[PDB]
Amino acid sequence: HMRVWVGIDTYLAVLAMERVERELGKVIGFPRLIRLNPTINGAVSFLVEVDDVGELVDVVNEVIIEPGAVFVDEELAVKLKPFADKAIKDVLQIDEALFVIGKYFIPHLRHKKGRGLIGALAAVGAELEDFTLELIAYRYPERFGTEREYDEESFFDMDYELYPQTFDNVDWCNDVVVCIPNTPCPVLYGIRGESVEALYKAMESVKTEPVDRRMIFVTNHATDMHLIGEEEVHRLENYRSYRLRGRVTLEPYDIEGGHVFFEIDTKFGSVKCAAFEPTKQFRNVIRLLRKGDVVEVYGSMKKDTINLEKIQIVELAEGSERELQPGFYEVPPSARRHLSKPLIRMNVEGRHIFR
Numbered sequence: 001h002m003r004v005w006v007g008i009d010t011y012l013a014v015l016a017m018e019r020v021e022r023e024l025g026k027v028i029g030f031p032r033l034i035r036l037n038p039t040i041n042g043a044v045s046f047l048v049e050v051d052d053v054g055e056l057v058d059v060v061n062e063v064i065i066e067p068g069a070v071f072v073d074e075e076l077a078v079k080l081k082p083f084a085d086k087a088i089k090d091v092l093q094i095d096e097a098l099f100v101i102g103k104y105f106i107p108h109l110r111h112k113k114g115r116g117l118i119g120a121l122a123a124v125g126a127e128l129e130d131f132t133l134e135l136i137a138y139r140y141p142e143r144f145g146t147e148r149e150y151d152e153e154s155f156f157d158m159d160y161e162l163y164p165q166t167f168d169n170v171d172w173c174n175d176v177v178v179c180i181p182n183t184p185c186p187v188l189y190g191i192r193g194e195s196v197e198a199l200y201k202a203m204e205s206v207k208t209e210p211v212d213r214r215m216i217f218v219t220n221h222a223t224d225m226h227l228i229g230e231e232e233v234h235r236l237e238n239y240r241s242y243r244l245r246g247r248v249t250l251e252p253y254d255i256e257g258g259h260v261f262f263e264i265d266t267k268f269g270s271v272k273c274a275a276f277e278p279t280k281q282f283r284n285v286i287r288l289l290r291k292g293d294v295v296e297v298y299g300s301m302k303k304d305t306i307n308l309e310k311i312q313i314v315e316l317a318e319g320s321e322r323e324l325q326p327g328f329y330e331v332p333p334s335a336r337r338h339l340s341k342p343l344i345r346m347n348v349e350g351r352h353i354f355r
């Protein structure tokens with residue numbers, strides 16, 4: 001009656017859970033989908049209770065044989081907490097992962113360099129203060145790689161009935177069904193929501209080709225777990241994401257490609273921000289900024305540039321009737337990054353929500 005956490009680095013995890021739940025023991029609660037630093041990113045972890053940890057390792061390996069895997073006890077699980085934090089909000093080297101695995105004799109399956117190990121350990125050690133659920137439907141093997149068939153309208157009807165119990169599944173303004181991937185992966189669709197109830201209802205209203213397997217995951221998606229407040233650092237750096245307050249010093253200007261840039265003066269000096277082309281209408285908002293506007297930006301730092309996920313216009317330049325209204329703005333659903341918390345999940349005022 002041993003309780004162990006499996007860390008893998010989602011389809012394969014589901015196949016693995018299956019064999020566990022049928023040949024070695026049960027699975028406690030909901031499996032977990034953890035995303036790592038978005039600038040460097042998924043990894044799955046699940047709690048199980050078997051008798052022979054060695055047996056459990058034997059299974060998973062066969063499954064992986066038809067990649068990093070870790071098997072830690074609920075005990076060590078709490079220790080990996082910091083490793084998980086650094087893997088999500090900072091940068092880790094595969095050395096640091098090999099160290100932990102070595103220090104606590106964590107049984108594992110290593111392949112080559114073993115960069116799958118960082119995710120495997122991170123998935124197990126991640127402590128979720130906030131979280132969201134995701135229902136992932138899979139296709140039958142026979143259809144992997146072919147074109148997904150589904151009724152676009154059914155997803156829009158579904159969001160119309162469930163939103164916000166389910167969210168960021170479709171994009172009305174840009175007319176896109178964002179919960180459906182366009183890759184050779186086994187995933188048919190991935191609906192995000194606030195509960196099993198809503199997700200189950202969603203799965204029942206949506207129309208698509210026959211769904212083979214399905215799994216509701218607990219994830220750090222849409223939580224803002226990657227953001228570092230500016231009161232926590234002395235200097236900013238690339239490959240990290242922040243929530244910075246600043247004052248516009250250089251007004252918006254477009255560049256080749258449909259992107260809009262500008263700069264803000266901050267406790268750290270001037271910082272350049274951007275609203276790349278995929279953000280669509282969100283650029284309309286950005287183009288209205290003016291020298292003097294005080295704001296608070298949220299985003300990943302890359303090449304010394306904040307890649308806007310959302311922004312808050314705190315104060316409009318003192319000396320102006322402008323179109324810009326104070327309050328929150330965010331990229332449309334189709335430009336949403338996995339870890340970005342959507343305004344519909346934030347109990348704040350002045351939220352301008354684009355559905």
Ligand SMILES: N=C(N)NCCCCN
Pocket residue numbers: 167168169170178179180190191192333334335336337
């Ligand atoms: N609804 C989802 N499962 N994902 C939404 C992703 C939006 C950015 N591509």
